[PDB]
Amino acid sequence: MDLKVVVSLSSRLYTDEIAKMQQRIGCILPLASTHGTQNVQGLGLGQVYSLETVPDYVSMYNYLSDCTLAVLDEVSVDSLILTKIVPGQTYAIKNKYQPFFQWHGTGSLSVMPPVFGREHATVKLESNDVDIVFPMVLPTPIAEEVLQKILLFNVYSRVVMQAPGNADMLDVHMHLGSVSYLGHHYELALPEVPGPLGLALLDNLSLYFCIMVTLLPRASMRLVRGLIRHEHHDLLNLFQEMVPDEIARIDLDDLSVADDLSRMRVMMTYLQSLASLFNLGPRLATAAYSQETLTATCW
Amino acid sequence: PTIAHGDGRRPSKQRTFIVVKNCHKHHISTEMELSMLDLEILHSIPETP
Amino acid sequence: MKVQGSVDRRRLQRRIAGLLPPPARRLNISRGSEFTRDVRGLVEEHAQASSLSAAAVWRAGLLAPGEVAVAGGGSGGGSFSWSGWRPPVFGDFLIHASSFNNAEATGTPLFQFKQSDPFSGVDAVFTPLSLFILMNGGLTRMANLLYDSPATLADLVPDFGRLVADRRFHNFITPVGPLVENIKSTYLNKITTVVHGPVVSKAIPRSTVKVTVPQEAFVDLDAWLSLQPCPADARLYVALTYEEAGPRFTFFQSSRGHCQIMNILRIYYSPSIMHRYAVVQPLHIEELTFGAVACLGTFSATDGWRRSAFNYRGSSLPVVEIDSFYSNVSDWEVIL
Questions:
Q1: Which residues contact B30 (CB under 8 A, 6 or more apart)?
Q2: Pick from A6, A12, A77: which is nearest to B27 by CB?
Q3: A59 to each of A45, A52, A198, C4, C223, how far by Cα in Å?
Q4: Cβ neighbours of residue C126 under 8 Å, at least 6 residues apart?
Q5: Which residue in A106, A105, A101, A93 sits closest to A145, CA to CA?
Q6: Measured between CB atoms, does A210 come within 8 Å of chain C?
Q7: How far apart are CA A36 and CA A82, in angstroms?
Q8: Do C334 and A270 touch (CB under 8 A)?
Q9: What is the distance between the alpha carbons of residues A79 and A73, in angstroms, rounded to a whole number?
């Protein structure tokens, strides 16, 4: 019923700063405690994104789902007033994130740790000796790509990790280093070395892939074997005329409809369970949007 | 104020200080719990003793 | 000279007057008052279950167009919600009286097995203890005192040998929700449980239902791992795990989140996966799957699960009871 949280600042914040925080109105940020009165220390994402310790995007991902969320309402010299986000309610939310993306009407939105930049998210509170690190929310289609770019950088910057040749920068930054949006290129903050929880998450992928690799239906491989040479397609430009050598090796046996039916069944249950792996964050659905008002109605 | 002196020292003219003090705001909260069975029987008139 | 030109303003004012007032909050306190009838208005909860008299229904307000009863006649109905309070949805079952033991705990979660015969009159429903007898001092003794003649369970499930070998047993079982009311009938019992809602009993002297699980099965996933956030909700899960000695049924509690919990389980079952995947078991197409995990509903974190005993014929079983459950069931997710 009465969902609100007031965060009392210990020391008065400066005049030049009250302008910065007010620009961030209607922006989600995660609270540690679901109680009516709180301190600043739990307010932002800054405890899990400390300047001293090395960043870990998955660690911030897990923290974002655990926390309760709130929308920023009012900024004063001494107090910030917010309203919590609860499952059975509707909220008027605003698009005020600095690397700008234009939301589609009636599309789900995804919340994510600050990936395009540490500087973009921070509003440094020099007075109270803290810094408030907002999360970043994007449309879900583009957030899924951002997640993949980060994961594939761990695995590839492990093999090619440091090569005196152009092996690195040949494709890793040319492919994974940046997301390109409509008429724009947004650079990504790629961590130099992943130590925690990034490799631990990819381990659970290779667990699925080593199960799934056995369950591949053979009728699928034999279809693509012919399509690459005989016909031409937009999708098949990836494979030049030459077929992969491994596909030529698995496809020795003749087809059987009885076998594939039991592979496509068992594989399907593993793909459904895959979807729960890639989430890693909370998502919000939208009902309306006004490019002149920049105010969606999330849910 | 100041004092008059006999030396040729550079004289401090009239001076004045202006200082500002501001308020601080404090908040207090608490939570109490009650069961629904308890709140519900506040609404209904009781039949028997 | 007063040209009628549209809907009269005065009539719409009366009709929007009723929709305007929202539910009341944020009342201010005066020790000079120290209490008010106004505070009662904010506090009262104003519930259902009238007395069946002709006016007692109207006084209580069960005849309300809303999903929840509100009194006051025309004056009532202004809240248009109760913080999203949703009435419970009930599920009625018709069960053999020999398959379900009457001395259950009214709050135990129930599981319905999907029969594979059409036009069937009676359902098949299993408690977490009956499931133990089926899939096969602690649990063993208390399960047997309740359910002797394990055949009366194995004939309800005639494919049990083939389903555990194909790793397909779990999808024919659907979680339903805790017992709420049980009628004792000598041949065919009428069992009622709550599917998707705040689990509250229908007893007329109003009482509190708290869902129970045998402590041998309950694994507190938090405190097994042992700033960090302290959220409000916590969730209860089940796991059906196909192992060597047989399928096993356990319960879990945590508040982390779905993507984390699936990871925690793959490291909680890492010894039992290896031991099964060891020389004991060979690769095959279907024998791969290890287990399935579903969520049964949320309850308040920071508290809300006690420990107690369940007595029957001079023997006790350690049991945990969760307070103020909210049933919300999802489908099974395969883990491996």
A1: none
A2: A6
A3: 11, 15, 8, 67, 20
A4: C110, C111, C112, C113, C134, C153, C173
A5: A101
A6: no
A7: 10
A8: yes
A9: 11
- Do residues A96 and A103 lie in contact, with contact meaning Cβ atoms separated by under 8 Å? no
Resolution of the coordinates, Å: 5.5
**Strand partners for C250:** C239
Q: CA of B23 to nearest chain C CA: how many angstroms apart?
A: 24
C79 near C23, Cβ under 8 Å?
yes
Residues in chain C within 8 Å Cβ distance of B36: 45, 47, 200
List helix spans (H) across chain C.
9-19, 37-43, 56-60, 130-135, 139-146, 151-154, 160-165, 258-268, 270-277
Q: Residue-wise over C244-283: b if at least 16 C-beta within 10 A, else e?
A: eeebbbbbbbbbbbbbbbbbbbeebbeeebeebeeeeeee
Q: Which contacts (CB < 8 Å, 24+ apart) does range A200-205 have?
A: A200/A58, A200/C263, A201/A58, A201/A151, A201/C263, A202/A151, A202/A154, A202/A155, A204/A277, A204/C262, A204/C263, A204/C266, A205/A277
Q: What is the Cα–Cα distance from A238 to A252, expressed in whole angstroms?
A: 24
Query: Does residue C231 contact residue A66 with C-beta atoms inside 8 Å?
Result: yes
| Paired strand residues for C126 | C111
Closest chain B residue to C59, measured at CA:
B44
Closest by CA to A6, choosing from A35, A27, A32, A28, is A35
Looking at chain C, which subunits does it touch, using at least 3 CB pairs closer than 8 Å as the criterion?
Answer: A, B
Method for structure elucidation: cryo-EM
Separation CA A265–CA A276 (nearest Å): 19
In A24-63, the residues whose Cβ lies within 8 Å of chain C are 30, 32-34, 41-42, 47, 62-63
